[PDB]
Amino acid sequence: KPLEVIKIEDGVYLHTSFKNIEGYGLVDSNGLVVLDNNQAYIIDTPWSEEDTKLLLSWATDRGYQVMASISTHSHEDRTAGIKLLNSKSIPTYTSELTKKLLAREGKPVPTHYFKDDEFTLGNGLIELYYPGAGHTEDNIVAWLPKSKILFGGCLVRSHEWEGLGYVGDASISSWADSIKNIVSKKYPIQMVVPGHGKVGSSDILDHTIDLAESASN
């Protein structure tokens, strides 16, 4: 089934990609599109090239210019559309580490990267922060100061889940600390968006800390 895009705040839309697993059912993956006058910014590509093309059409059919994407770690559900965005001359961004992990895997790389633990896109529309290893070594989060939404990506676990999920690339013993570094920013969080599953409140941070500590033991 195709990409779904639904409004979750003024100028903020959740995009969800799906894969249909024979014998199991549909699984899904979230990112955001953030709108500012006539400019759009994508936080995580959709999960496939085809879905990324649908996301671009969504924006441009509405008269927006897609200014940039940012991918919040190197896995395919965050980065599948980088190649397409690059082919359309849309700036793609990741952290330096994420870029280097993609390059090391022989995957298309973003055309731009940032070196520090913090970076901003869209002149403060989106504030990126690397809190430490968790779901992966390179996972970053995005804070949207206007809408008070934290896109936690795959580092955070929605309440629908009673486990950490895939941990093949995880640093389980650092994960709780990395969430605590997010808490220490004292963002006035109204909503937290996960990489997989339903939008929640700031309590998703506590839920994740607890899943992390349990797994550590």
Q: Is 135 annotated as a binding residue?
A: yes
205 binds Zn ion (CB under 5 A): no
The smaller minimum CB distance to a second copy, of residues 8 and 167, is found at 167
165 binds a second copy (CB under 8 A): yes
- Three-state DSSP string of the chain: CCCEEEEEECCEEEEEEEEEECCCEEEEEEEEEEEECCEEEEECCCCCHHHHHHHHHHHHHCCCEEEEEECCCCCHHHHCCHHHHHHCCCCEEEEHHHHHHHHHCCCCCCCEEECCCEEEECCCCEEEECCCCCCCCCCCEEEECCCCEEEEECCCCCCCCCCCCCCCCCCHHHHHHHHHHHHCCCCCCCEEEECCCCCECCHHHHHHHHHHHHHHC
154 binds Zn ion (CB under 5 A): yes
Q: Is 73 annotated as a binding residue?
A: yes
Query: Looking at 124, 166, 190, 201, which residue binds a second copy (CB under 8 A)?
Result: 166
Query: Looking at 6, 10, 26, 89, which residue binds a second copy (CB under 8 A)?
Result: 26
> Closest approach of Cβ 156 to a second copy, in Å?
15
Q: Could you give the string, one character per residue 33-72, with x where binding to a second copy holds by CB under 8 A and - elsewhere? A: --------------x-------------------------
Instruction: Kindly give, in sequence order, each residue whose CB lies less than 8 Å from that of residue 170, ignoring residues fewer than 6 positions away.
Output: 133, 134, 135, 136, 164
Q: Is 69 annotated as a binding residue?
A: yes
Q: Which stretch binds Zn ion (CB under 5 A): 94-102, 141-149, 150-158, 175-183?
A: 150-158
Query: How is residue 119 written in tokens?
Result: 């970076």
Q: Which stretch binds a second copy (CB under 8 A): 76-84, 85-93, 97-105, 199-207?
A: 76-84
- Binders of a second copy in range 121-160 (CB under 8 A): 160
> Closest approach of Cβ 58 to a second copy, in Å?
20
The residues of the shown chain that bind a second copy, judged by CB under 8 A, are 19, 21-27, 29, 47, 75-78, 80, 160, 162, 165-166, 168, 196
The residues of the shown chain that bind Zn ion, judged by CB under 5 A, are 75, 77, 154, 195
